[PDB]
Structure formats: C-alpha cells, structure tokens
Design a protein around this nucleic acid. Structure first.
Ligand code: MG
Ligand code: MG
Ligand code: MG
Ligand code: MG
Ligand code: MG
Ligand code: MG
Ligand code: MG
Ligand code: MG
Ligand code: MG
Ligand code: MG
Ligand code: MG
Ligand code: MG
Ligand code: MG
Ligand code: MG
Ligand code: MG
Ligand code: MG
Ligand code: MG
Ligand code: MG
Ligand code: MG
Ligand code: MG
Ligand code: MG
Lengths: 181, 57, 244, 170
RNA sequence: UAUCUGGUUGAUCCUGCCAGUAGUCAUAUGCUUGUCUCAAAGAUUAAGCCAUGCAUGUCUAAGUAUAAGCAAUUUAUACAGUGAAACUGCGAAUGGCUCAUUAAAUCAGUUAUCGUUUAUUUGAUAGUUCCUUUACUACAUGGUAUAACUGUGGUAAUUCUAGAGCUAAUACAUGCUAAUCUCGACCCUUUGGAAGAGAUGUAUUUAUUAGAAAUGUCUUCGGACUCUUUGAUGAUUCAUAAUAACUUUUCGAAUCGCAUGGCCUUGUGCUGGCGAUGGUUCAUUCAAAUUUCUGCCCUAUCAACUUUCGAUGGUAGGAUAGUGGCCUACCAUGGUUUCAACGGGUAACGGGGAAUAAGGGUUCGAUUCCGGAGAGGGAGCCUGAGAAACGGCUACCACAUCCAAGGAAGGCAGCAGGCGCGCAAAUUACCCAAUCCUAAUUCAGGGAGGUAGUGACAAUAAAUAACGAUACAGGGCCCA
RNA sequence: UUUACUUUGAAAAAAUUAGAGUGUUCAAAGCAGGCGGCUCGAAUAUAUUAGCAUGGAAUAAUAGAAUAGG
C-alpha cells in the first residue's frame, strides 16, 4: 500500500481540569478573547509548553554550543516573526517568560477587534468566519490565524465583501427590491 | 505450542502423527508407494476391592 | 521468494532518488545493467523527477523510443536502464550533455558538460586478469571489459575511456597526493587528496583523505575513485567542488 | 525422497531439531548410478541450471594414462579387483572412482614396442612388477574419473608405492 | 499517594487513622452526529468451511497465414495491406494475503564463497588453407511431422477427445562452402621483392608439464652491435598456457525487416548499407544456496543428555550446482552440561518501531517497511535459469459439488460477498486511463494499484449568530 | 607484553523521532530549490551489545634470561 503519513494531536488535556484556578483562568481567557471552547486554550498551552521546554533544554546547554546557538537563534527568529517576542528581548530567558495571553493576542480575531474593523471580539470572530476579512490579497476565514508583524498592517475588508466595496448582500438588495416594488 | 488442542484434530490427522513421532523421540529419555507412478470409576473399583477384602476379612 | 524479485516499493527505494512517498506505491526498479541497483539512477527518474522534461511515464517512454537519449554514446530504450556514476547522457535534440556525479548532499546532480568532455568517461579498475588465449583485460566499475590494456594499469587505478571506440586513452595510478572522489557512505560526494592508505591483510583497506579546507576524513577503499591529480581534475566538477 | 538438508540431523548438543520448513528442491539428491561392466549404457540427467550430467549405467572401456611414459590409451575393462570403501562393490563388480580395476595391456604393450623397439635400453627399463603384469596380460589401474557424474571410466595405471600398497592389500 | 470532602464525641482546636476522591488506554457497549482536510478497516489461540463473479496473459517492419477471414490493387503469378485460430518464444517462481509451525531455529548487526548455480541486462569474445570414393546440395538438406484446418465419430457430463486426410518454422533432425603468422638465403638498399624451412579451432574427462664490470666497441653522434621475455592475492593445484588420448557429446548463424549504393570484361556477374533475432566462453548485473562471531520469554518439584535406528571425528566412495555424516562402508569413542546441557510451556513469526517513565526500567509490536514460512493436513514430482509451486500435477486423510450410478470435478490465510447462532456492521461498485510490473510489445493485460461508496478507528480546522434603539421597575450581587 | 576498560572514526536501509526552511487561506500535512554570478538555501542529529580501524598515563588481570650463579 501507499506509505503511511504522519499526524499529531495539537492539544493535551490538562493534568487536573477541575482545579478552580484553572476554571477561572479559562473563563477569563475565553471571555477576553472570545474563545469557543477549552480545546483552543489547551492547544495554545500545549504549544507554549513545547516552546518553553525547548527553551529550558537550550538554557541547560553551555553557551557557544553549536546546537544551542543554532536552534535557539531559530526559535528566537520564529517567535519574533510571529510577533510574540519583542525585538529588544531576543534571548531565551525572555522566551521562558512568555505566556498564553500573547499568542492569544496574535490571533487574527483579537487583531480585527483591536484595529477597529470590529466593535467586539465576538463581532470580529463573526466577520472573520463570515468571509469579510482579508490579509493582503488573501481572504482568511479562520479566527485562529496567527498574524505576523508584516501581515499585521495588511488586514482589511475583502474586495468581494459588501463592506469592502462590493455590491450589497442578499438582505440589502432584497429589501431594496421590496421597497422599490 | 507444539501440542496444543486444535479445533478439528480429525481434519489434520497427518499433522498429529508428526507430533506423536516428535513426542516419542523427545521423551525417549524418560521412557529409558510412489504417487507419481504410471500405474497405481477408579474410586468405585477401589471401593469394591476394599469391600470384598473386608468381607474375606 | 521462489525467484528473482521484479517490484520495488517506494519506501524501500534508494533515499537519494528523492521520490515522493505519496505519489504512488511502487518505485521504478532498475533493470539489470552496468551499475548496482542501489548505486544507479534509472533514466525515468532522470528525465521526470530531475530534468522535468517528462511529467510521467509513457512520455518518458516516448522520449526514449524516439531514440533521443544516448547513454555513453549508445541509444537506450529501457525506461529503467540503470545509469550510474560517471555515465554520459546526451540529448541531441535539446543540445545537452550530462555527467552523473553526486553532489555534496550525496545525490546525483544535474551537471551539464561540453561535447569535448562528453566524448570520454573514467572507469575505476576493479579487476585486471588474463583472458582466454593469454589476452589481458581490465574490468572497470561500470562492467566494461577492455582487452589489451597497458601493463602499468593495476587495480584501484582509473582509466580514461573514449566512448566512441571504448579504448583507454590514459590512466591514473592510485598513489598519495592524487585527487579523489567519494562514491559511498556518509562522506559520499566529497572531494579531496589522498594522504595515506592503511592496509590490513584479510580486511578492508582504509584511506585517509584531506580536503582543500585541510579537514581530514577516513573511508573504506571500495568507496574511493581517483579523478585526477591535485588541482587538475580530468573531469568538470559540480558546484562546491566536493567541499563539506 | 533423498535430501541433503542438515536440519533433520540432531544438533551438536544432541537436541532433536523441529521441522523448520518443507523439503526444498535446491537441496535435493538423486539415486546412485551403480555403474557396471558391460555394453555401454549412458543416460543424461538435467541438473540445476541448463547444465547436464551423464549417468554411466554400463561401461566397458575407458581411457587410461601411463604417467611415467606420459601416454594415454583407450582400453577395455576386465573387472574390479579392489575398492577401498566397499568390498561388496568388488563382489558385484560395481564401478566408481578410486576402484582398483584390471585393464587389457595390448595397446600399452604395442606402444612400448613401437617407441622403444624392445620386448635406449636404459630408457626402456621399467619397474619390474608392471613388466610382470605385461607378461600376464592385465594391468592394475585406478579410476580417477567419477562415472556417475561425467559418464567416463578414465584413470591411470598403478606404479611404485601405489602399486606396492595395493598389491599388499590384494 | 498527592489534592478535595466526610466520619472518628457533650462540644471546639491540634495530631493520627478510615472511607470516598486521580490522568489511564485496551475491549465491549449506549446516546448524538451539520461543514473542510484526512485516514483505518484482524482476532472463537476458528491457518474453521465456502455458492457466485473476477484476479495472467502477451505481437513488432523485423519466427510461421492460399482462414474456402476482411479490405484493397496499375484487377493481381511465390508472398507482400490488416488479421481470427494454431505452432513457436517469453511470463505465469512477480504481486497480494496470513502468522499456522518455529526458542540458537527465524530474525538484527557483522563475515566468507580460494565452497557453488545464475534466465535476463551491459562489455568483450569464434577466418582453423589443406587433408583420396570430388562418384560433390550450399544459388541452402529431410519427415526420420504435426497443430490450426477438411471430414467422420464416442460420452449424461468437464478448458475430455478417437480415426483418417492436409500443410509451415528462429519447432525437430541433419549438414558445407583459395587463409593468416614466424623467420628468411639471394638481390636491392627502400613504402623494398621473396627462392624456401616452418606453425594452425572450441566444448567434456583423465594424466602430465610451465606458472621463476657491454662500466665495452664503433657510429653520422643520433643510433647499432649481445642479453632480457608471463600477471594477481595476505594466501592456492589461481588466471593462463603446453603435451597425449577420450566423448551415444556440444558450439563454430541452412533465420528475419527496411533500402538499392559501388565496380566493371554487360553477366538476373562481383561487391555492398542500417537493424532485429540467435550462439561458445569470460566479466558485469538481477539473484539464489550455504556460511563466520555476538545477541532470544517462563521453567531446576526438568541433572545429566546424545550414541542399538549417526551422535563426535577419520579415510574412501555416492549424491549435490557445490562445502559438509547429506547418505553409504569400515574405523576409533567421541560431542554438550550448574557459565543451566537435555526436556517441558509459550493467547512465541523476528526486526525497524509504539506506549509510558525524571532517570533506570516495564509492556505491546497479526497489522502500511526488511526478512522467514504457508496456501485444509501429510508425502512425492513434470516443466523451466529460477518451484518441492498448489488461481501446476499425482497418491493418502477429513470434508464436499454434479451424475443417466457407468464416471467426472474440488481447494477464497487473493478482490468483493456468505456460513460457522436463534442476536447481526464496508460495495458480489467504476477504472487500467496517475505509480510501477509482465509480454513478441509505445498500443494489450494488471480486484498490484487507484477512484468513489460504506458504523464518529486514529487526527486537523471550524458554523449553530453579530450590531443597535426604545420602554418599564428598584433592587441586584458577595462574605458569614 | 597481551587482554579487559575507555576516546574518536567508519558502519548500523527507508519510513518513524528531534531539529532547520517554506503564508497548504490557518492547521494536521506535503515539500526541496529561488533572482539574473547573486558568496542565497534540511546545518542535520539520533541509536545498548557483537564485528572493524584508531588515541590512551590510571584502574583489574596477564607475563619476564627481573635484583641469577661460578
Ligand atoms: Mg462571497
Ligand atoms: Mg511474494
Ligand atoms: Mg579479501
Ligand atoms: Mg495475403
Ligand atoms: Mg506452447
Ligand atoms: Mg521447546
Ligand atoms: Mg527477456
Ligand atoms: Mg495425423
Ligand atoms: Mg554408517
Ligand atoms: Mg503461534
Ligand atoms: Mg510483526
Ligand atoms: Mg512458498
Ligand atoms: Mg481455510
Ligand atoms: Mg520460462
Ligand atoms: Mg505444495
Ligand atoms: Mg485460491
Ligand atoms: Mg501464487
Ligand atoms: Mg476476502
Ligand atoms: Mg487491494
Ligand atoms: Mg456471523
Ligand atoms: Mg522479433
């Protein structure tokens, strides 16, 4: 048969999901960033845990080690490119200081809310899922889209969107036709 | 696994013959045509033994 | 199995070919020929996955049986013909000549060459022996038997063969200071100069090689191919000159 | 039926090995060819690959070599006299390699006569016992071929220590 | 065994104890189930049993067409286009499935073949002049022959076949046709001529044999005068060569497509191009077989085992492709073991791997890749380079299909689909058109494979709403 | 002196794992090449034991016509 292809889980159940502390932290995070469920928070926590475990393992190794230098520089480059890690903090120690809230901030939904295209986080999610938002020339319908520093300045209404210069939606033209009739 | 019970021992009688042959040679220490031719229970018996001797007694 | 195998599955194919694991289930099994199965690049892979002139099979077949492809100056029509190291592939219609030489990564590289260089190849002398009627001959790494060789030619030497006539034009002896190419192992594709040949009777001989950067590495003798003297290769080298 | 496989045999420790697999063709054996003296009867055997083997069911003549003189002549076979492995083969006059056999002396005698012209003298001098054999009319020879393989009865006449040894054993 | 709750009395504290409280990830099972990407389908230790259908055939200009086949033509004078059937050649020994059996066996890593076979691919490789009956086919030999086909027939029945008549080969069996090289007297002094002394393939078998102070003279200043004379491996009776015979003994082209060039003394004279298919031997390549060392779960309430009927070794023979107690004959008495031999169990195919763990460790691994074995259970074989083959054959055991009872035909652990219960689960789907494989071959074939369909296997992303205005009421929330 | 032991180098298929790059609309994934010389690009790593080569002073065995005799 055809060769196997790899797949992996992007999240992990927390150790003790019934800690009240975890429940209230998740409540705050979901409310602030309009998250649909806890699987998203678990996904972000899993990614952050992997990153911080890698950074700890790097910080274990002696400074000037080839492996440390190379792969740590790669990690800093990726983190700054995603925008999570600021330009002035390009060190693994600040990587260990990272948080879920920053990755949530870099989500597209939060950015459509912040830039003023939407009046609320949930309105931003609606607009993104609804095919009204475009990064550059590409329409993105995924709230979990992680925007880069360069891509941040290109978020706008899509050319095909009624808000971006296209014709009015079905509701608008239906009401206009009924009014004319 | 050599001598496990099989689902249908009759259907593979030839295989069983080999197993008995292997069992014979393996345990021997403890004991001590041409087809392609042109033309072709105990407790009760002990119980009675005790009875009869008890009578003869 | 009750006989020779005729199928090669993609995961079991040589890694250096760079075959997609999801394109299919089988890979082109090299037919019998001059080179080893694992050390050969079948013409289908060359024409499709490397040169991109053909998109898929029967177009490779059609290219072949129009007689546009010549391997070592002879027309071949077998899709899985096992072209290998130092083989000359000529496409007259497009006016291209290629020599099959591994890059530093260890995979066969698409190296374009001139006609004058395409007129000849090099063969490592695998064997030297007298044939019937007291006729000496040399067997090279590509299975070429050349009768009546020069007496000075010994095993591990390299003979320059003219493709048109299949005769030895010159030869290079295996000695320290010679320019050498690695044709296997983890150092496969690197180029250097010989330093010492460690000899073990009844065992595999080991050779020390020093690159232009002065880095030294050791490799088994079966993995060694003389290509010239230091600073004067007899063939054109890929980009990077077998460094790193 | 005949197989050369080593799995059926006991291990060096004496353990009785179990049947690993069914019998294979590449490890086959064939019935012996008990060659005997008589009118030539040979049949071919198709063997592994495209090769062939010749089976001497019967043979009465063979090429024998006088090594001291460096000559070879074809000669009829009288009979088997001594075989080191089996006396039963001698009794049944079975022909195999190393068998000591009696051969007619006529061609070798006539060649000696033509070359040396004696019934020069120093060269014509030959060991005594073989001359006595010439007088008898039969010579002791050792078969050096394998009749069950090449289908031939070719060998060399005994001499020197060889002849003395086999004479003692006779 | 951490955290959380509760009980331990007349109550409240502080200890201690007890109960409940935890991610598992495997099996079964219940409910629900909109979208995108996607991916899998074992299990009664039952390797238990199967209706039906399919899964291996194959043709280029280039092996064989008077098909009474088709169509053509300048309307045919050996044929020529295309081509059913059959002969011939090749393949069917690949693939796919499963894990029955197997505990130094397989398997992993690592070695050897100076111990042997090898279709196919690739590269080389064979002028033997002559030798009386020449009473002579090589401008090309036979049925020592048949299919397909014509015609007559048997059987209830099958991929059953009998008699008679025909005819082909790259089928079968036979058999041929003035050369080259050593010296070279004599002339001649070179681009030299040659009176004449000489030499002559392979294949098989055995024996034998080989295989290891010229430091000068002259010369034109160059050069000449005499001598050398096998190679390889760490290692050989290696490679190779030579002599003498030997063989129911081979090979050394009686084959085909396209095209019609060059010489002339003008003859259907001589010569000549590009390819295909065959053939000896060697090397190479795809392989195969043995093989060196180390590494296997539980069991000592299995301590001695193997050797009568081969166990260890020696010699010889037989057989093998070949080494070898693989087998035979005779010889000795050997071989393993408390460093666990031998025996027994194993819901034991092994490995790359998977799960967990902080590290050591523990468990799983039929299952996408490598290798091994098998095709209901034993046994034996034809063919072919390659099989102990099973979608090849023969016998026996167990099942089981048809029958006119005389016989005939069987092997789904291949793709679908059933039975095994009276309780249950993917479609008897489409395509050889992407991958590669097979063939005479671009084209034909491929349930290998792919496409789609079908129980939420395992995974990814992600809808079920968003933004406002207006009106009314004073109570809402948290701790204790 | 030799061995054990230890250092490094070859070797240990691919797939899998870790790791580098890449806006598959994100992600699970797949993937190796771009501009007109540009000094651009998976840089790669990973395996207890057995076998091979190699640098070793300690440690543990192993050796001596060692400091012998006249
Ligand atoms: Mg739209
Ligand atoms: Mg197979
Ligand atoms: Mg060697
Ligand atoms: Mg016709
Ligand atoms: Mg046939
Ligand atoms: Mg056992
Ligand atoms: Mg073929
Ligand atoms: Mg007839
Ligand atoms: Mg015996
Ligand atoms: Mg089992
Ligand atoms: Mg397994
Ligand atoms: Mg089999
Ligand atoms: Mg069955
Ligand atoms: Mg065949
Ligand atoms: Mg069978
Ligand atoms: Mg079947
Ligand atoms: Mg089969
Ligand atoms: Mg099935
Ligand atoms: Mg399938
Ligand atoms: Mg059922
Ligand atoms: Mg042909």
């Amino acid at each position: 048969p055809r060769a196997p292809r790899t797949y992996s889980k992007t999240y992990s159940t927390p150790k003790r999901p019934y800690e009240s502390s975890r429940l209230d932290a998740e409540l705050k995070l979901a409310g602030e960033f309009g998250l649909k469920n806890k699987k998203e928070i678990y996904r972000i926590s899993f990614q952050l845990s992997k990153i911080r475990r890698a950074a700890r393992d790097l910080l274990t190794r002696d400074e000037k080690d080839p492996k440390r230098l190379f792969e740590g520089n790669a990690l800093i480059r990726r983190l700054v490119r995603v925008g999570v890690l600021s330009e002035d903090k390009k060190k693994l120690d600040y990587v260990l200081a990272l948080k879920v809230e920053d990755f949530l901030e870099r989500r597209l939904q939060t950015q459509v809310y912040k830039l003023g295209l939407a009046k609320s986080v949930h309105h931003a999610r609606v607009l993104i899922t609804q095919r009204h938002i475009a990064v550059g020339k590409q329409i993105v319908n995924i709230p979990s889209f992680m925007v880069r520093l360069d891509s941040e300045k290109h978020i706008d209404f899509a050319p095909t969107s009624p808000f971006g210069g296209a014709r009015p939606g079905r509701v608008a033209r239906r009401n206009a036709a009924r009014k004319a009739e | 696994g050599t001598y496990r019970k099989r689902f249908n021992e009759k259907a593979r009688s030839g295989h069983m013959a080999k197993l008995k042959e292997l069992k014979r040679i393996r345990n021997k220490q403890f004991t001590r045509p041409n087809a392609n031719a042109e033309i072709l229970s105990r407790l009760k018996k002990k119980r009675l033994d005790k009875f009869i001797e008890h009578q003869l007694k | 199995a009750r006989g020779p195998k005729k199928h090669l599955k993609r995961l079991a194919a040589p890694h250096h070919w760079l075959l997609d694991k999801l394109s299919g289930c089988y890979a082109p099994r090299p037919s019998a020929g001059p080179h080893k199965l694992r050390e050969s690049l079948p013409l289908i892979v060359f024409l499709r996955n490397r040169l991109k002139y053909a998109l898929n099979g029967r177009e490779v077949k059609a290219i072949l049986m129009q007689r546009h492809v010549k391997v070592d100056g002879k027309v071949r029509t077998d899709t899985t013909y096992p072209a290998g190291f130092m083989d000359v592939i000529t496409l007259d219609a497009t006016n291209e000549n290629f020599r099959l030489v591994y890059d530093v990564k260890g995979r066969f590289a698409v190296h374009r060459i001139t006609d004058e260089e395409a007129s000849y190849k090099l063969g490592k002398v695998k064997k030297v022996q007298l044939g019937k009627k007291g006729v000496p001959y040399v067997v090279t790494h590509d299975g070429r038997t050349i009768r009546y060789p020069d007496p000075n030619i010994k095993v591990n030497d390299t003979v320059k063969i003219d493709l048109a006539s299949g005769k030895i034009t010159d030869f290079i002896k295996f000695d320290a200071g010679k320019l050498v190419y690695v044709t296997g192992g983890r150092n496969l594709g690197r180029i250097g100069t010989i330093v010492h040949k460690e000899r073990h009777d009844g065992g595999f001989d080991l050779v020390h090689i020093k690159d232009s950067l002065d880095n030294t590495f050791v490799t088994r003798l079966n993995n060694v191919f003389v290509i010239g003297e230091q600073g004067k290769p007899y063939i054109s080298l890929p980009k990077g000159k077998g460094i790193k | 039926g005949i197989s050369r496989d080593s799995r059926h045999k006991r291990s060096a420790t004496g353990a009785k090995r179990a049947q690993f697999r069914k019998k294979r063709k590449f490890e086959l054996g064939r019935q012996p060819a008990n060659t005997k003296i008589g009118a030539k009867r040979i049949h071919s055997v198709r063997t592994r690959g495209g090769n062939k083997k010749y089976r001497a069911l019967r043979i009465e003549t063979g090429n024998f070599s006088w090594a001291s003189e460096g000559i070879s002549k074809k000669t009829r076979i009288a009979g088997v006299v001594y075989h080191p492995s089996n006396n039963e083969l001698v009794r049944t006059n079975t022909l195999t390699k190393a068998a000591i056999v009696q051969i007619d002396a006529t061609p070798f005698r006539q060649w000696f006569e033509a070359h040396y012209g004696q019934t020069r003298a120093a060269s014509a001098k030959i060991e005594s016992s073989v001359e006595s054999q010439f007088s008898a009319g039969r010579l002791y020879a050792c078969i050096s071929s394998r009749p069950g393989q090449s289908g031939r009865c070719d060998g060399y006449i005994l001499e020197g220590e060889e002849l003395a040894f086999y004479l003692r054993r006779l």
